[model samples]
Target: AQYEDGKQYTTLEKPVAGAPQVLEFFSFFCPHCYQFEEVLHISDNVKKKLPEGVKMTKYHVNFMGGDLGKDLTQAWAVAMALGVEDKVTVPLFEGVQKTQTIRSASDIRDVFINAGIKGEEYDAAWNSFVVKSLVAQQEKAAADVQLRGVPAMFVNGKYQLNPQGMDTSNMDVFVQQYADTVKYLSEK
Candidate 1:
């Protein structure tokens, strides 16, 4: 579980369809998750460092306990459904952490509104079956991994990267370790 190269990597029983699966279990309300995402802005974005086949996706956690957890989780799923995660994630995080502006469903609606979801289009996607299914997925994934905390990154579907388990602190480690470990696994 420990790597000597300052890059700790864990293998998954079954990856997310390509090379490796990186399940980013987090919540927008969690400050550490926000900090990690913000720190990512300072370095190369994570996608750039992923090896040819590694697949990464975020799963919002509900253990934080609040309407925000359910709301943001639903919002995240809705955003992903429209394929706007790349565009919506940053502003959503900034809005919650910095501006403290997005606190309810109406506010969540506005975030996507700015993202160009117009009139009835917003209502359609917001209430779409995809969002509901994805919301259910978040719960099941957390249960599958027996997740106890947010910002948990699981490799494949088995190995967990955490400070206590196998781990990485910031985007630098997440990206670099992905480049190092996942690519190494790709060859063997």
Candidate 2:
């Protein structure tokens, strides 16, 4: 029922049957994105009960040119290319909010090296064409969505939700609602 009645989203065309799909559009430099990850802390525990055939994807929004957000987004693409996203997600987040040490993408390497990834391999992945292409695709997709702000969710690629819904005052409640809504869509 949260499919928006085809008003806010395209519900007539649900996601393909290749497993239920969930997507999160966010950014590192956005405070709400940080809160949803750090305060609500759903990156690990939220997806626990999701069914076996479900697929989840995260994108960096990749908007707001030439700021820390873009650098972080590019760094995310590189980390993903190197398959170290699971390792770098939190550290990079802390680097921005807590430590305040990551002023540029170069600082992202320290998080990777500390995670035991070789410097040369990290550099290679950063420079890989796959990283380039994926980042470019992220750019186009962000534009296509015509996003109004950070921390948006698309359920099964057809329904878009603010992810905050009615619980805007409490970030934890909003995230819990997000998990519940996405889970509901997945089950349906």
Candidate 3:
């Protein structure tokens, strides 16, 4: 479905009925999300070790709308809508982080093209229904959750991991604990 500006998405609602819930709220332009990559990987691995009914849904947050944020968010929504998330998410993140040079929507589009998505398709998706829906969904999520920054988390709609509330010096610990808490809630 195409996303409209200022709309709310309460859930993505996983396919599996009994799967453990893990909801991650993050932003593509967030330096902290980039920094949290390793921890996220570790958490994913740990979750993988769990029994069959475990699920993790990563929600890309978008609070800002300037070039860096808007362009990245556009790339994300387009990739997601096109069902090329696995192909595009990492490269997009890498491009945003590794290069000192300025990045633009065209540059991101080029990355999507390199990932085997057609340039025309990318353009259409960027300006299409789902991208609009996703952006508006994200905006609404940020507002509804009252998020102050990126990389926040909600586990089974219970605990909230706001950056302001956690210890930044030991982020890995907090993330792992948050994931563990989610697993517990899912099992309960």
The numbered model that scores best in TM-score is 2
How many clashes (backbone N, Cα, C below 3 Å) per candidate? 0, 0, 3
Best-to-worst ranking by lDDT: 2, 1, 3
State the lDDT of candidate 1 residue by residue for 1-188, as single tens digits: 43532345444445444312656777888887777676744123545656776567778877673887788888888877888887788888888888999878888888888988785776887788888998998888777766777766665665555333334556466556544553344334
Look at candidate 1 and tell me the lDDT of residue 118. 82
For candidate 2, which ten residues in a row score worst on lDDT?
A: 11-20
Kindly list the per-residue Cα lDDT of model 3 for residues 108-150, writing each as its tens digit.
Answer: 7878888899878788888897789887765665565566766
In order, candidate lDDTs are 0.68, 0.69, 0.61
What's the CA error at residue 135 for candidate 3, in Å? 1.8
Off by over 4 Å in 1: 1-20, 41-45, 163-188
* Model 3: how far residue 89 lies from native, Å: 2.1
The candidate with the higher lDDT, 2 or 3, is: 2
Q: Which ten residues in a row have the lowest lDDT in candidate 3?
A: 1-10
Error of 2 at 123 (Å): 0.7
Q: Between 1 and 3, whose lDDT is larger?
A: 1
Native-structure RMSD, model 1: 4.2
